[PDB]
Amino acid sequence: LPRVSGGHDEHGHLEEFRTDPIGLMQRVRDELGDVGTFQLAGKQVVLLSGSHANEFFFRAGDDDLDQAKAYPFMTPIFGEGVVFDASPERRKEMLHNAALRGEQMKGHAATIEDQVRRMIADWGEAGEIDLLDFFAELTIYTSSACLIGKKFRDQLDGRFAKLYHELERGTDPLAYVDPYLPIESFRRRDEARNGLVALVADIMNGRIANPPTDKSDRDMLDVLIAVKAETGTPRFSADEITGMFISMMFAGHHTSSGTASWTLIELMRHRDAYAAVIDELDELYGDGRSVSFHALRQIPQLENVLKETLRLHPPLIILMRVAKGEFEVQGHRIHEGDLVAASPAISNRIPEDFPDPHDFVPARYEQPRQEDLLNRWTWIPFGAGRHRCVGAAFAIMQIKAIFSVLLREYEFEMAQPPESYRNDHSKMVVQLAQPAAVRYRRRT
Ligand code: HEM
Ligand SMILES: O=C(c1ccc(O)cc1)c1ccc(O)cc1
Ligand SMILES: O=C(c1ccc(O)cc1)c1ccc(O)cc1
Ligand SMILES: O=C(c1ccc(O)cc1)c1ccc(O)cc1
Ligand SMILES: O=C(c1ccc(O)cc1)c1ccc(O)cc1
16 A cells, blocks of 8 residues: 655654644645645544545445544534444434424524524624634534523523634644644643533523523433433433533534534635625515525525635545444555545545636536535535435535525625635644634615
8 A cells, every 4th residue: 555755754644634634635645646645743544535435435334434533623612421332323313303304404593593683693784703703603503502592692601612622723733643742732732621520410400490480492412411220320420411412512513603604704705606696685585485494495595605615625535434444445455454545635626526626616506517416426525325414404404594694694804814724734623824804884
């Protein structure tokens, strides 16, 4: 198995992975094709790209390509003392049944709409915001309100959002060496989790001390608190509930937050797309129906802008797995213990599949191009096959709900040069580099 160039010998490509992971992965493809390798210290990473190789990846059962130990940076976050022994598929199943059922979508759209109005309540006539600060906080509220419950969300304040952020900043790729290296970002990460457990414990004690007289406001915290082990003792501790809540929201927070920011960035970068979306929204809402109604149904132009934003700026730039056995892909041998990865960042821009891959072209999703549909295994912002993101429908609905409100009320423009808006790839969790100042003005 040949490796990409530039390896720093002993450390391999670890340092490049911590600064320019996309450049590294792209060089692996440019140099080795659909199957190449790079190393993170002693760990071997087999990087797959292209339709054939990606299909292998996405059709692989968790018994051949395990997600289990593929993301060591998450263990200290969900919590060591956790019973996350539920197959990643079991987890997806529980989350779905609890908060992602189709019949729940309309209520979620209304919740999200409400949360957005609450966030822009004091915006006034005009001003400026930082995209990361705004969307990171907004999605903490939409996520908690929808996935856990409005009652729970209402018991939260800025502290929760700030601590959660420290969790995401605690995902330095060095976790592939040791998730407990004595570095400050990992220390802040561990303190942040203890801070979150404390906030939840406080709320828990309040729920237990004064049981909800109502019942129609009952949320996921109430549900978890009531569960009893066979011995008859409460099944979950504040620590486990916190871990479960963190897990419920993690995959959906930074992805939705970053996607909302980039959707607005691309709209502002392309004046004609922006105009097209504004006219579409105006016409659409002119029928007098609600956001909860329209956000669940098609909004063509805004959706093609979202699909293109996702193709160019996928929030998860690399998907990881650990080979549980011996495999072979296009002649390249994969060994047990090897890390195996797929990359939306790289695959979403393969020129043979997506002409002019670096250009923003929403029309590539209209007929007859329908590039997302004709390139199932390479258009993968949400993954594909059995590992397709379980929150996709929710994420799509949220984006529509969020912008239906924002773009109908305010108009935005960059407060910085267009090139200044970019991602920070120093942690496994991608987020906008700051500042990302944007000016807003109430629409007349
Ligand atoms: C535009 C935003 C989103 C993008 C592009 C995205 C992307 C992805 C991708 C590519 C994966 C599979 C990664 C892998 O195989 O390791 C994934 C998994 C997952 N996504 Fe999403 N996602 C988004 C929003 C959300 C939302 C809003 C939710 C929650 C309602 C969510 C919940 C999940 C879950 C539960 C998993 C599996 C990880 C776990 O069990 O903790 N995603 N997502
Ligand atoms: O960055 C590393 C590192 C560890 C292994 C390797 O091959 C290259 C670099 C690091 C960070 C903090 C420490 O305390 C010790 C090593
Ligand atoms: O509702 C849940 C649940 C909690 C967290 C999560 O990420 C998914 C589902 C639940 C209910 C009863 C149980 O015994 C255990 C979990
Ligand atoms: O946020 C995650 C994540 C990883 C495992 C999990 O159970 C939930 C979320 C992530 C971050 C960076 C990546 O490259 C891939 C996934
Ligand atoms: O069909 C979509 C889709 C993606 C964005 C949008 O605005 C509407 C539909 C899709 C494709 C593949 C996935 O894995 C998840 C959703």
